[PDB]
Design a protein around this ligand. Structure first.
Ligand SMILES: *[C@@H]1O[C@H](CO)[C@@H](O[C@@H]2O[C@H](CO)[C@@H](O[C@@H]3O[C@H](CO)[C@@H](O)[C@H](O)[C@@H]3O)[C@H](O)[C@H]2NC(C)=O)[C@H](O)[C@H]1NC(C)=O
Ligand SMILES: *[C@@H]1O[C@H](CO)[C@@H](O[C@@H]2O[C@H](CO)[C@@H](O)[C@H](O)[C@H]2NC(C)=O)[C@H](O)[C@H]1NC(C)=O
Ligand SMILES: CC(=O)N[C@@H]1[C@@H](O)[C@H](O)[C@@H](CO)O[C@H]1O
Ligand SMILES: *[C@@H]1O[C@H](CO)[C@@H](O)[C@H](O)[C@H]1NC(C)=O
Ligand SMILES: *[C@@H]1O[C@H](CO)[C@@H](O)[C@H](O)[C@H]1NC(C)=O
Length: 1310
């Protein structure tokens, strides 16, 4: 019959408004027929559950593109039937029959197929339905993800094999992109391509189902004979599972879960799997709370300067004049004010209104945009003459991107128009993938997709010359930019967004997939907002690999200074090479995200239970299931439900394998199943990420007596959930970068630990913390919890000193910028806590970052543990704003103002010079202005050559504090009293490199008058800031050692080398900070540089946290040297406290270990010494912290509403609240404004400051009653700085105790 590939299935059509699911089938073979036999259209009203008979398929008629179903049952209007009408248009896919509108007794349907396309050029041989419908009649349509040219590569860890699926139809093999997808057999859909040979694995049998939770399933199966020899007697079949990505489920590429026979199994988390948008509206410009769909038909009424501002459709017998969405009509209708009006070609006088612009319905049904009119005229039956218009997503349209309406198939005075246009052409959800392929090696940028979660997108820092008018750059890596805080009112279908006071700006669109370029991943956004000359804003995010660093943000590296181009650069982790990694003790170490998935929280000792109709599976992660029916070492065991006969599905296995957000536990061997091959029963459980699913229930899915395959929606199979330690101040626009204080696994381990002493050996609560991540594995305290409180279980036994648990909080917020230029970082929703038990809740962790522009070392200090809020205090370098700090003077030495690091490019001062071979242009080059091989100009021998010799140049460089250093040379000709030829060099970090050579990045010559600049970037080791270091190290016993003093060095630490033959060599050495710029050394980070013979053995890299030992002892090993007999190196510095401060002495040498014994006073454990009046005597340095010069004034601090007077070391004199007559010796007051200004008494005078590991805590206690029990204390923390004594109120801790930090000069050890 008509439309031959449309009979085999039953098609469903929802009307979202009324909730009436219409079930259609063309030739009338319906299985759900409670309605009449051979039912064409069976209306199922969902709330009355009525099954009305709308179509008799035996009375099916036809028109040019139009199936009518004219039933026998009479309408409540006489001589009318309950008609239905299915209009047929061309898509690229089979589609689904969307619901246009309906009066009481006709129902109109748009249905855009391949079956309507009678030009079958590259036709689909087998094409199944691709839509589902859950209980509430919400749509899972996936038609726009059907690739009609080529196949989606399915990401597995096998470099040799490659599966190539194509959703809901056979793979177009002929006109395809890849060389190995042309090899494919015809009519295949799964196409395993093994070693220049493509098998037909999957064939489309049945259209996709919704069987599970909300995830769709779709199964391909190949039946018959001629199975490959891979399958070992199984039919090849591929089941793809379509998941919708929420905040819980991350990915956007299809992943191969089970490759353990020709039964393949794919979890594909696509945005199209999500509930498809049904948003209709009144005249034009439909939009909803979901701001992904953007329609406006004003540009179909706002006609170009070209003539005939109305449209004309060329029709059957008589042509239709029409002007939609409030445009000037045709003069042939004269005076109708009709947005469409039909015109008779017999007589120009008989004109009938076919639509009016009072009654519209611009309906966006499931990607298929429709525009309906109503109440045109009366026709020959009694039907109001209405008219529909079906828009098509036709990009390169005629009439300057508007296109013309074609008329298709009038029924019952209802005119169906099809319209190829661009201003009704939406990408609603992303169809494009975010994986690439460097031939073999795959990548996945799905982690850094903030994917329609409506939780804030990324904010790009300005590393690059922002000016006065500096803006918020809101990128989103793989999606339309999320409409959230500070990004709402942005033009939607933008990927990067530029927003200011003046207005938001589109800054590129996700037009094309990512591409692997130049040893990184480029991500080019074309088609942005309009720049100067009708050029659109391009944007090139270069996502680079950095292992474990998901918490960074894109730096803005360059611009073009005319707003046509903005290049970003992201030192991320989700743009690093995917690899299979394997784990032994039920712990698999993720490499490309720096996570370590332990699944021992899933080991239930009493069994799990999966129940299908035929079997009961008792399965257990990383351990034997205890059920007496099965063999004892059973990892999994199916018992029947009728026979109750056991079969052992593989013996106990603790071997996990992680690849691309799924952990495969395979269980196999065990008990065979009575075949002459003696094939053992194996099963494979796939743990894959669901951030709020707990331990999870495993699921069984397959369809034969076969090798069994489970998936397990864990919470513990999940990476860090990148949350971007970056905060932009709203009122100023100062970005702060905490993304280098994120300590990640794979490195030397460690955490940000901070002790609390107070009372001896009880409430020694040693608090671990980590910034914007989960913790590292630290035994016993939680995973996915950023801070855990490890108390001591030590009864003074040297062996009996260990740590045990509390669980403080999970990083979801990211840093928030607080008052007085500090920034607060909340961890909400920890473990259940004890308090004043009026309300017990989850723990929180407040950590306040106040910045000291000191040295590279950073150690957190413990503020308070108060009413389920553990406070903290970051004295770091990274908490200060982003500064670029250009130096026009001497060039190959630059100091970072925040970190205090010195980038020296003196080993890049190559006296032979660097040759940059360019594009038919030789650039001879050197960085410190050395190379006189070219023109030695007036005081400019500065290495400026485009070869025959361009110029000698004036020199300047800048840093950014965020992975950007550039040297902006400028030649002697300032070109015609304008700007000059100023050609630029850029730095980035390759860790494993020598000093190196340039690679010639693009030159950009634009003679505006005389401007040109030739950028040539080069990867060197001397280019990026080392991560802030924890030079303070604990031991298991609780002695808190601190070597931060040994890293403050005026000259780098030498060593008395007097032992080994009394040689004339030196031995440079450091502690927890790399050695500075000793020439002829591997200076990326070096522990100790030996100097002799110009044979400079660089014999160790800096170990951040040294090894521990006995009472008052450390040991520090530098592990990664050079060139010694299958050993890199080792240098042991025994940091053994005596109480001199001598030089680390050369002890002896053997087996390429150079060993030193450092008698320092830094190697003594930190003791909290409590001081006298204002002074602390001999706190392990033998110095005195006399802070009475800060008691010479009333010190006013402020909050927003509150005010906090106090006075260091005695006797606050004036206030609003010296309102007492007692012995009150008031040294504080917390205040308010005029209303509710009964303001409270001090922390009373103590004249006692306690020394805490380099902070000085002064405690003013014994105020008035606060809420219930505690008194209104105040506390001052004195940290090192050059007396920026404008106090940081440490905001929103305990409401009964106020923390202050003074960045004062007297608190510094001299
Ligand atoms: C921003 O990213 C886009 C990527 O979409 C860059 O466009 C690409 O620019 C390169 C370099 O000229 C083009 O490569 C050329 O390819 C041809 C063959 O197609 C080859 O014969 C040439 O030797 C050259 O390698 C590439 O075609 C082009 N891609 C486009 C336009 O889609 C753009 O240059 C980047 N902008 C930057 C870094 O400022
Ligand atoms: C959008 O529709 C237009 C108009 O039908 C298509 O443009 C035609 O394309 C064919 C094939 O290349 C050309 O032979 C015609 O000359 C084009 N028409 C005009 C007026 O120039 C266009 O191909 C459609 N785009 C898509 C993506 O389907
Ligand atoms: C850091 C700090 O403020 N410490 C103490 C606080 O715990 C106590 O309740 C009060 C009086 O001893 O104030 C002080
Ligand atoms: C269908 O409806 C039209 C309009 O009333 C009528 O003229 C035609 O005869 C009908 N045909 C069938 C088969 O029901
Ligand atoms: C480079 O330095 C010159 C100094 O004359 C300056 O005019 C120019 O703006 C600087 N930057 C660039 C990108 O050329």
């Amino acid at each position: 019959a008509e439309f031959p590939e449309l009979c085999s299935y039953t098609w469903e059509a929802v009307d979202t408004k009324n909730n009436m699911l219409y079930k259609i089938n063309i030739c009338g073979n319906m299985g759900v027929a409670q309605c009449g036999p051979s039912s064409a259209v069976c209306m199922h009203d969902l709330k009355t559950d009525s099954f009305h008979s709308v179509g008799d398929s035996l009375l099916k008629t036809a028109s040019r593109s139009l199936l009518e179903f004219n039933t026998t049952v009479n309408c409540k209007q006489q001589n009318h039937k309950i008609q239905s009408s299915i209009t047929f248009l061309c898509g690229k896919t089979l589609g689904t029959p969307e619901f246009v509108t309906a009066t009481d007794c006709v129902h109109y349907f748009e249905w855009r197929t391949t079956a309507a396309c009678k030009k079958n050029i590259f036709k689909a041989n087998k094409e199944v339905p691709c839509y589902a419908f859950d209980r509430e009649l919400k749509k899972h349509d996936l038609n726009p993800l059907i690739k009609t040219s080529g196949a989606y590569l399915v990401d597995d860890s096998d470099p040799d094999t490659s599966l190539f699926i194509n959703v809901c139809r056979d793979i177009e093999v002929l006109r395809a992109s890849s060389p190995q997808v042309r090899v494919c057999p015809t009519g295949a859909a799964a196409c395993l391509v093994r070693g220049d040979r493509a098998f037909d694995v999957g064939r489309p049998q049945e259209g996709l189902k919704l069987v599970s939770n909300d995830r769709l399933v779709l199964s391909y199966v190949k039946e018959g004979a001629g199975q490959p020899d891979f399958c070992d007697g199984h039919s090849p079949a591929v089941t793809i599972t379509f998941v919708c990505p929420s905040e819980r489920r991350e990915g956007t590429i299809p992943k191969l879960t089970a490759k353990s026979n020709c039964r393949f199994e794919i979890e594909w988390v696509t945005e199209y799997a999500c509930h498809r948008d049904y948003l209709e509206s009144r005249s034009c410009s439909l939009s909803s709370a979901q701001h992904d769909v953007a329609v406006d038909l004003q540009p179909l009424s706002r006609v170009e300067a070209s003539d005939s501002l109305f449209y004309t459709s060329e029709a059957d017998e008589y042509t239709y004049y029409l002007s939609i969405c409030g445009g000037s009509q045709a003069p042939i209708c004269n005076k109708k004010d009709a947005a469409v009006c039909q015109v008779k070609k017999a007589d120009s006088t008989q004109v009938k209104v076919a639509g009016r612009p009072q009654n519209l319905t611009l309906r966006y049904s499931d990607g298929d945009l429709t525009l309906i009119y109503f109440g045109g005229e009366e026709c020959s039956s009694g039907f109001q003459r209405m008219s529909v218009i079906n828009f098509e997503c036709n990009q390169t349209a005629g009439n300057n991107g508007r296109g013309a309406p074609v008329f298709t198939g009038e029924v019952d005075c209802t005119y169906f128009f099809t319209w190829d246009t661009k201003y009704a052409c939406v990408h609603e959800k992303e169809a494009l993938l975010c994986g690439v392929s460097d031939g073999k090696q795959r990548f996945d940028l799905s982690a850094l997709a903030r994917h329609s979660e409506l939780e804030q997108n990324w904010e790009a820092v300005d590393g690059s010359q922002r000016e006065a008018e500096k803006k918020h750059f809101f990128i989103n890596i793989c999606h339309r930019v999320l409409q959230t805080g500070q990004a709402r009112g942005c033009p939607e279908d933008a990927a990067v967004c530029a927003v200011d006071k003046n207005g938001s700006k589109n800054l590129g669109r996700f037009i094309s997939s990512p591409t692997r370029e130049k040893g990184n991943i480029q991500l080019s956004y074309s088609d942005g907002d309009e720049c100067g000359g009708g050029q659109k804003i391009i944007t090139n995010i270069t996502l680079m690999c950095k292992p474990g660093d998901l918490e960074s943000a894109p730096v803005l590296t360059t611009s073009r200074a005319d707003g046509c181009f903005y290049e970003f650069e992201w030192r991320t982790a989700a743009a690093c090479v995917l690899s299979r990694t394997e784990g032994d003790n039920c712990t698999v170490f993720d490499s490309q995200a720096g996570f370590s998935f332990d699944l021992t929280p899933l080991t239930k000792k009493d069994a799990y239970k999966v129940e299908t109709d035929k079997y009961e599976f008792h399965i257990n992660v990383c351990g034997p299931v205890s059920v007496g029916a099965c063999p004892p070492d059973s990892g999994a065991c199916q018992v029947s439900r009728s026979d109750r006969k056991s079969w052992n599905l593989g013996r106990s296995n603790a071997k996990l394998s992680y690849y691309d957000g799924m952990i495969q536990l395979t269980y196999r061997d065990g008990t065979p199943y009575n075949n002459e091959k003696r094939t053992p029963r194996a099963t494979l459980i796939t743990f894959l990420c669901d951030r709020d699913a707990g331990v999870g229930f495993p699921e069984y899915q397959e369809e034969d007596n076969s090798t069994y395959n489970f998936r397990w929606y864990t919470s513990y199979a999940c990476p860090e959930e990148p949350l971007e330690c970056i905060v932009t101040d709203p009122v100023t626009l100062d970005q702060y970068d905490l993304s280098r204080l994120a300590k990640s696994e794979g490195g030397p381990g460690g955490n940000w630990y901070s002790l609390d002493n107070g009372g001896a050996r009880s409430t020694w609560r040693k608090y671990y913390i980590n910034v914007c991540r989960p913790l590292n594995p630290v035994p016993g305290c939680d995973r996915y919890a950023s801070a855990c409180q490890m108390k001591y279980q030590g009864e003074q036994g040297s062996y009996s000193e260990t740590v045990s648990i509390s669980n403080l909080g999970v990083a979801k917020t990211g840093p928030m910028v607080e008052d007085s230029g500090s920034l607060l970082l909340e961890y909400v929703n920890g473990s259940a806590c004890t308090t004043s038990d009026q309300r017990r809740t989850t723990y929180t962790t407040r950590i306040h970052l106040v910045c000291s522009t000191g040295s590279l070392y950073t150690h957190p200090i413990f503020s308070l543990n108060w009413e389920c809020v553990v406070s903290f205090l970051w004295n770091t370098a990274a908490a200060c704003p982003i500064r670029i700090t250009t130096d026009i003077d001497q060039v190959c030495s630059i100091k970072d103002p925040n970190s205090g690091y010195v980038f020296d490019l003196n080993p890049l001062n190559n006296s032979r010079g660097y040759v940059v071979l360019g594009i038919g242009k030789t650039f001879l080059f050197n960085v410190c202005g050395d190379m006189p091989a070219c023109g030695t100009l007036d005081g400019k021998p500065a290495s400026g050559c485009e070869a025959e010799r361009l110029v000698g140049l004036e020199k300047s460089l800048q840093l950014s504090t965020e992975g950007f250093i550039t040297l902006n040379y400028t030649g002697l000709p300032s070109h015609p009293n304008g700007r000059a030829d100023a050609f630029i060099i850029r730095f980035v970090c390759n860790d494993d490199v020598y000093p190196g050579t340039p690679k010639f990045l693009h030159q950009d010559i634009d003679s505006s008058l005389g401007i040109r600049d030739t950028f040539f970037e080069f990867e060197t080791a001397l280019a990026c800031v080392p991560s802030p270091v924890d030079c303070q190290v604990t031991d298991p016993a609780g002695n808190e050692y601190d070597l931060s003093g040994l890293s403050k060095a005026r000259k780098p630490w030498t060593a008395v080398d007097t032992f080994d033959e009394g040689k004339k060599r030196t031995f440079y050495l450091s502690v927890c900070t790399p050695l500075p710029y000793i020439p002829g050394c591997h200076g990326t980070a070096v522990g100790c540089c030996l100097v002799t013979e110009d044979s400079k053995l660089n014999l160790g890299v800096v170990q951040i946290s040294p090894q521990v030992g006995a009472n008052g002892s450390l040991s520090l090993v530098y592990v990664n040297g050079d060139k010694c007999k299958n050993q890199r190196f080792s240098t042991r510095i025994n940091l053994e406290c005596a109480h001199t401060t001598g030089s680390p002495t050369f002890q002896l040498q053997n087996d390429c270990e150079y060993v030193f014994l450092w008698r320092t006073v830094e190697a003594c454990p930190v003791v909290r010494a409590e001081g006298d009046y204002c002074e602390v005597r001999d706190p392990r340095h033998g110095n005195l912290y006399n802070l009475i010069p800060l008691g010479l004034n009333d010190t006013v601090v402020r909050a927003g509403e509150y005010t906090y007077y106090f006075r260091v070391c005695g006797e606050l004199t004036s206030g609003v609240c010296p309102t007492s007559d007692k012995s009150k010796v008031i040294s504080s007051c917390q205040e308010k404004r005029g209303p509710q200004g009964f303001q409270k008494v001090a922390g009373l005078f103590n004249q006692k400051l306690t020394y805490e590991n380099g902070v000085l805590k002064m405690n003013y206690t014994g105020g008035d009653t606060c809420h219930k029990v505690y008194q209104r204390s105040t506390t001052i923390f004195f940290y090192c700085d050059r007396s920026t004594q404008a106090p940081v109120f440490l905001q929103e801790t305990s409401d009964c105790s106020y923390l202050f930090e003074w960045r004062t000069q007297y608190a510094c050890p001299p």
